[PDB]
Design a protein around this ligand. Structure first.
Ligand SMILES: Cc1cc2nc3c(=O)[nH]c(=O)nc-3n(C[C@H](O)[C@H](O)[C@H](O)COP(=O)(O)OP(=O)(O)OC[C@H]3O[C@@H](n4cnc5c(N)ncnc54)[C@H](O)[C@@H]3O)c2cc1C
Ligand SMILES: Cc1cc2nc3c(=O)[nH]c(=O)nc-3n(C[C@H](O)[C@H](O)[C@H](O)COP(=O)(O)OP(=O)(O)OC[C@H]3O[C@@H](n4cnc5c(N)ncnc54)[C@H](O)[C@@H]3O)c2cc1C
Ligand SMILES: CSc1nsc(NC(C)=O)n1
Ligand SMILES: CSc1nsc(NC(C)=O)n1
Ligand SMILES: CSc1nsc(NC(C)=O)n1
Ligand SMILES: CSc1nsc(NC(C)=O)n1
Lengths: 588, 588
């Protein structure tokens, strides 16, 4: 086992040094490498239980057994004397820059995973290039480096969530003694957008400065894998060229879907355009039922918009459906309208968008209900949030041999390898993995360490916690309640649950039995917690820490023997006692 | 072991039924007890691994070995036939109400632990009386049922913290696009106080309704333990009488200290009076450095007050002192003044409090610094937060034999027993235990189950998490950094740490490297997390869940292999990497 590991480590590392912590000849080579600004991986054999065998297996590559041993791209370079000799003779730089390929690593896609992979690999000497390019939306929207989350995702959408929550802060402030009158305050959309966009712009810039400071070539151009080690690039002026790389990481992500109906691409928008929209949407129709659909409808309504959501079948397919319905009911009771079991057939234009005065157009939406009734109504803006998909045919010449699934996502082993042995995929395009920014970062960074630093640690994709930032937030970790019953049988499942009420809602006179939380547990496994769910303020901050306990296999007794922090919302999890089978009510 | 347990269970239970889940004769006695409204404990022997031996040991008390067996106050009452016979003959009620004593349980003190103990014990048939009485403050302040937290503690102080935070919500709202101008909004103290007091009043009332619905006698009178089973009571009209009880729980809590200097009791106030003060404090001097001192100064300043804190030596003695100093520095940079290494000698009055117009008086404070300089300054209000202490000499006739320590707190074993075998203590008066409302609840409820339901589970007092609700909040669980070094040696301690910045602070243009968090770990124990610390918004909600992981013994690798929720503050704990020994900076 040790042997096979050392062979894979030596073959892929760019510059790697085997060492011991207490050896002056190792120090001597380290000081030489630091002086000449040579970046490299370092493995200290005296801090590995396996290191004595490893020190013996290095003689397969170098025919010696002492430390230090320096390797470049699979080739043994020398012990202490030879490296110093290479240095003294002005030979060391040309040896470490020697390669079959232009780059040790080419990343296609400069988003969450792409930039994480690229920065980490550069730290261990891997000569790295990150490629990024933003195909404009149908109306021409575009943005800078950083990928979906930074530019048209988690970041601008949580800040617009914050401004939505500040409306209820203003309401709440009257009851706590502040003098303002909420009903004489209005919201200015473009002022909000300028502040959000300004923060994004500093992220774009910060990422560029990060790549430059890690010696990463950044190319603003479209990448096409034409063979295992050859990537074709087309830049902004349509100039076409080829670069080669030893390892290839695919991190191109996804883009929004449009329903195939007349008028949709012409007259609707998506989340890609919403976050830099120069005008307030006005009376808005959201077509879709995903978490994207509900978060966007949610903050548009809190900023004073007239909002309808058109629901084909159910809300939040794939999430715990009781939690989904609580989520939806909260929105409906605070000014979001729902058009349930409704599908659109057509969008007709009645006014073009007023580019000069920054005012929305006007649209007519025709649809029908399953009961036969026609849907017909006017909206100033129509947003589509009906899914997302990758566009790999534009990236992957099918003759290279990368296996895709029926949805067009890349099939990988559990270390992210594709069916082409030097090509990997991370993030939203990795088939079957949760589509989330921290996941893609963990995958990129861990993969970079396996390739260029001999690491073994894999990314763990199970029981990853999520949060939906609807007006009342919803956090979950683990199995939904229905899936657990599905997997183990109703008799083996015990669900503890309770309503609650934040102390902050008392003086502000908000609802009594609306916030909610439950633990789904397995009876035959010491009451193991299979899934946790909470609906309430600050649901993300509440949920995060419990994810660590659940990863370690927490049981109902672990929740019970811990003591709460008071006064908090999250403490209700430490004193739960009402089961569902008992039939007792969860209310306060 | 089983034998000794069953003997203690039978001796103290009020009404307890031994049973099996699938026995129609058990059901038969259960249905009789439910019909006649007889409350009782029930132990189902078929759900205990030990139950076969237990069913054999019940023949020590009853000379039978079948189920069911009913016991009242240590006496075997009958199997199925005898109970039905007692019922049919109109004899059952007088048998279950038979006792040497008026009450199975007398609780002295109606606060967090007292009410928790009393409600739980009543569920298992224990005939219970809760005693509560609020000795007025020197200026005559007083309040209703519920104890310190409800009336003059965690509840009114977190709501006044919420109103303090709403000031920065109002500031923040401008940058997110809302139209208001913070500099034209002022705060009305008495309007805030009315809303806080109204919520407390519904808690007072709710607790009374709770005791009545659990058949608990509630006496509004001062309790004095004169012998192991005799409590003397003095009511509001000074009428004096005696009641007897089998078990006694002491839950009288503490009250604030005053420094022995001239003018202090006459002209200063404490937290006991602050939370219902009919006038705004105005320019205020806080004398003390505890968490009470800083939380109160904190919200007074955010509500527009001119505030000074007088610090004898250090802030927050007993907390991680780096975290304390970060906490203090934040306050100082946002309008709280600190008078460091300063002690008061005297308070002179310059104006009496204006009772009619609701306006504060005016005071002169004289003190001196350790460098020799005199302190002399005028304040409209002086608050003392210089400690809290119990008053057990007013409760415990020293001839009863309850051992106190040098601070006047009750010495108990790890199941809360005092040196008098039927007397227990819970909450702030239990010597050596964290003085916290959830602890006192856990202790009361678990004790009630041991006494009257045969439970064995003890309360776990280690690694209880805390939060300090200063303007920037501070949450901790486990060891402070200095104590861990003290216990295991610097060489064996590794501290990971990082600054961070909430996404919400970006658009509102707040500080860059002020929020902070660290993990204190032990090198020789798989990098076990010994202590966690975070300074930032919503610190309580952040910290709570990690307390569960730490109780199960989380390591640095458990934090690493869990994936974050994004965008949150709490996710920074899942990706920490900068150690202190490395000397790398923690900034962004
Ligand atoms: C509205 C919305 C809200 C979201 N909110 C959250 C949230 O709160 N939390 C969360 O965890 N996740 C959230 N997500 C998901 C999260 O953003 C993604 O999981 C994450 O962006 C995936 O990262 P990635 O690196 O795999 O892809 P991306 O971030 O999409 O990066 C891919 C990049 O590669 C570029 N590219 C594509 N093809 C090429 C090519 N041929 N050559 C060069 N460059 C190319 C793309 O234009 C893009 O810049 C949200 C997503 C959306 C749409
Ligand atoms: C300003 C302040 C803020 C706090 N904030 C928090 C916080 O955020 N979180 C937290 O966990 N803890 C907090 N605490 C501490 C928390 O309130 C206590 O730990 C808790 O109240 C202890 O409960 P107890 O039942 O032991 O005592 P108490 O709640 O003090 O109850 C004792 C009761 O018995 C009464 N009594 C006394 N003697 C007699 C007698 N002879 N006869 C009858 N009745 C009698 C007392 O008047 C009182 O009503 C705070 C405390 C203070 C002072
Ligand atoms: C993929 S979720 C989704 N797709 S269409 C829809 N709603 C409509 C057509 O009204 N929801
Ligand atoms: C979810 S909508 C809403 N309004 S106030 C709030 N939460 C607080 C004050 O903690 N939520
Ligand atoms: C017990 S903490 C404390 N006691 S006195 C003080 N400060 C002063 C005298 O100025 N802090
Ligand atoms: C701690 S003082 C302060 N002002 S705003 C804030 N926190 C947010 C907006 O999450 N804290």
């Amino acid at each position: 086992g040790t042997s096979q590991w050392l062979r894979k480590t030596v073959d892929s590392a760019a510059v790697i040094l085997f060492s011991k912590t207490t050896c002056p000849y190792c120090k001597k080579v380290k000081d030489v490498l630091a002086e000449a600004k040579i970046k490299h991986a370092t493995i200290e054999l005296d801090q590995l239980s396996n290191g004595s065998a490893i020190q013996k297996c290095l003689a397969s590559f170098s025919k010696i057994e002492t430390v230090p041993q320096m390797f470049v791209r699979g080739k043994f370079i020398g012990d202490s004397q030879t490296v110093l000799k290479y240095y003294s003779n002005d030979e060391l730089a040309g040896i470490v820059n020697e390669s079959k390929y232009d780059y040790d690593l080419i990343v296609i896609g400069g988003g969450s995973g792409g930039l994480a992979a690229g920065k980490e690999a550069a730290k261990y000497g891997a000569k790295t290039a990150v490629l990024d390019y933003v195909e404009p939306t149908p109306i021409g929207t575009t943005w800078g480096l950083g990928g979906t989350c930074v530019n048209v995702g988690c970041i601008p959408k949580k800040l617009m969530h914050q401004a939505g929550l500040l409306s209820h802060a203003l309401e709440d402030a009257e009851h706590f003694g502040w003098s303002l009158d909420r009903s004489k305050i209005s919201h200015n959309w473009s002022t909000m957008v300028e502040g959000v966009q300004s923060h994004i712009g500093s992220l774009n810039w910060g990422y560029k400065v990060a790549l430059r400071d890690n010696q990463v070539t950044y190319l603003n151009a479209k990448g096409r894998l034409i063979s295992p080690h050859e990537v074709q690039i087309t830049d902004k002026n349509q100039k076409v060229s080829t670069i080669t790389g030893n390892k290839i990481i695919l991190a191109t992500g996804e883009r929004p879907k449009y329903p195939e109906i007349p008028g949709a691409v012409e007259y609707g928008i998506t989340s890609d355009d919403l976050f830099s929209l120069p005008y307030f949407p006005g009376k808005t129709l959201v077509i879709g039922a995903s978490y994207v659909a509900l978060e966007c409808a949610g903050f548009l309504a809190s900023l004073g918009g007239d909002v309808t959501v058109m629901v084909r079948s159910i809300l939040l397919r794939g999430f715990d459906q009781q939690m989904a319905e609580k989520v939806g009911d909260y929105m409906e009771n605070h000014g979001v309208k729902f058009a349930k079991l409704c599908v659109p057939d057509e969008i007709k234009q009645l006014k073009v968008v007023d580019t000069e005065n920054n005012k929305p157009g006007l649209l007519l939406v025709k649809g029908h209900y399953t009961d036969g009734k026609k849907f017909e109504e006017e909206f100033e803006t129509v947003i589509f949030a009906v899914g997302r998909e990758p566009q790999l045919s534009k990236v992957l010449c099918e003759t290279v041999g990368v296996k895709l699934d029926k949805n067009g996502r890349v099939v990988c082993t559990d270390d992210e390898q594709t069916t082409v042995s030097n090509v990997y995929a991370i993030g939203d395009i990795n088939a079957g993995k949760p589509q989330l920014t921290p996941v893609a970062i963990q995958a990129g960074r861990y993969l970079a360490r396996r390739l260029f630093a001999g690491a073994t640690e894999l990314t763990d994709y199970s029981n990853v916690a999520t949060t939906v930032f609807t007006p009342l937030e919803y956090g979950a970790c683990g199995l939904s309640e229905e899936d657990a019953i599905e997997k183990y049988g109703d008799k083996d499942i015990e669900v503890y649950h309770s309503n609650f009420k934040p102390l902050e809602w008392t003086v502000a006179h908000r609802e009594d039995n609306v916030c909610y939380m439950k633990l789904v547990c397995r009876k035959s496994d010491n009451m193991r917690v299979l899934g946790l769910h909470v609906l309430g303020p600050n649901a993300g901050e509440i949920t995060q820490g419990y994810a660590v306990a659940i990863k370690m296999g927490a049981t109902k007794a672990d929740f019970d023997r811990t003591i709460g922090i008071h006064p908090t919302c999250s403490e209700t999890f430490t004193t739960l006692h009402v089961t569902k089978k008992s039939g007792v009510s969860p209310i306060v």
